């Protein structure tokens, strides 16, 4: 959805990366809304710990914010990308039908493009695609990739330090299942591996990741 | 924007595709929207003229209302086509990233998908794709296609049979300025042709289409 939070983070994004103070009056100027609005939303922004207005009325984006700006900003600079260098669309245009798109493509989509695109380093503009890690350029856990419809994954890590249930490690071992092995996933939750069914307890299901 | 507008006359276009009567009942089913809200919704389009509610309560799309179904739909269907055949997206994922996608493609993208993708006949569901006429497989006047910055574009139709201004008629031909033409308009609004600058009048803007 095209969330005006969302907007309002790449803003302070954007100002930060072109090295200027993220202040009220400049997201204001640049977001084209009033002034007793933005603060306003900032305001909401504040409460819900995605901002904090610093004693110099700067805002300082919290981690939280911080993750999700950059989320946003990926999106969008990954838009760009597909509209120039696949749908060939006019590149006076790209930048205002980015700034909508960033509001409407999923992870999964990303994880893709990241995959057809030749080169995802740079935006069209010529500024730097960031967070491409959360899309492998550590992982989902089981649990919320539970798939109740089976599904070919990778194992990204086990995590067997932060085991106290140790019954299912020779089961994993069994299974020829380990970091790097493909395995299936249909979600109590199961993971196959050359027919070989290994149905994980809530510990394991919980930090085990396949991405 | 995701105007839940353009999510109901979708709805409304997809019923009677499949043949189904557009009673509200089922609008609000399939939306997963509630009765009250539902007809709160059709109350607000129907005072917008987009649609206007039968005798027998069954939904009529007026040929407004009609007209932007038809553009949402084709720019839902052409985005399914976009994700499995450029993107490469899980068809089990492709309908809902489609559902958002259609609220944020412009025409300008469109146009272009036309372009790249190898066949917009049907979407991956085997659904034709309407509306494809609107986007060249009569035209934009040029005083709405009148960009301060030039652009070589194509005369789809001139309109001589509606001119009651017949001054630049000649200066057309002598700029070798037809229908298949093409010129470049900077906009009062100005076409070149070969070096060959001619100075529309308004009606001559008002009538002439750029496409």
């Given at each position: 959805?095209?969330?005006?939070?969302?907007?309002?983070?790449?803003?302070?994004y954007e100002?930060?990366?072109?090295?200027?103070?993220?202040l009220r009056?400049?997201?204001?100027?640049?977001?084209?809304?009033?002034?007793?609005?933005?603060?306003?939303?900032?305001?909401?922004?504040?409460?819900?710990?995605?901002?904090?207005?610093?004693?110099?009325?700067?805002?300082?984006?919290?981690?939280?914010?911080?993750?999700?700006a950059?989320?946003?900003?990926?999106?969008?600079?990954?838009?760009?990308?597909?509209?120039?260098?696949?749908?060939?669309?006019?590149?006076?245009?790209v930048?205002?039908?980015?700034?909508?798109?960033?509001?409407?493509?999923?992870?999964?989509?990303?994880?893709?493009?990241?995959?057809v695109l030749?080169?995802?380093?740079?935006?069209?503009?010529?500024?730097?695609?960031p967070?491409?890690?959360?899309?492998?350029?550590?992982?989902?856990?089981?649990?919320?990739?539970?798939?109740?419809?089976?599904?070919?994954?990778?194992?990204?890590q086990?995590?067997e330090?932060?085991q106290?249930?140790?019954?299912?490690?020779?089961?994993?071992?069994?299974?020829?299942?380990?970091?790097?092995?493909?395995?299936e996933?249909?979600?109590?939750?199961?993971?196959?591996?050359?027919?070989?069914?290994?149905?994980?307890?809530?510990?394991?299901?919980?930090?085990?990741?396949?991405?």
């Amino acid at each position: 959805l095209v969330d005006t939070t969302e907007m309002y983070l790449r803003t302070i994004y954007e100002l930060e990366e072109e090295g200027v103070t993220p202040l009220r009056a400049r997201i204001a100027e640049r977001l084209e809304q009033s002034g007793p609005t933005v603060s306003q939303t900032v305001a909401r922004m504040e409460r819900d710990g995605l901002v904090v207005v610093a004693s110099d009325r700067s805002l300082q984006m919290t981690p939280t914010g911080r993750t999700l700006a950059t989320a946003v900003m990926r999106k969008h600079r990954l838009a760009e990308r597909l509209l120039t260098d696949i749908i060939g669309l006019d590149i006076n245009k790209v930048h205002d039908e980015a700034s909508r798109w960033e509001h409407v493509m999923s992870d999964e989509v990303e994880r893709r493009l990241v995959k057809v695109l030749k080169d995802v380093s740079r935006s069209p503009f010529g500024n730097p695609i960031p967070g491409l890690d959360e899309l492998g350029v550590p992982g989902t856990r089981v649990i919320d990739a539970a798939t109740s419809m089976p599904r070919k994954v990778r194992i990204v890590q086990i995590n067997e330090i932060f085991q106290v249930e140790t019954d299912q490690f020779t089961q994993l071992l069994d299974a020829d299942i380990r970091v790097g092995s493909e395995v299936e996933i249909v979600d109590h939750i199961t993971l196959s591996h050359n027919g070989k069914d290994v149905e994980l307890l809530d510990d394991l299901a919980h930090t085990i990741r396949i991405e």
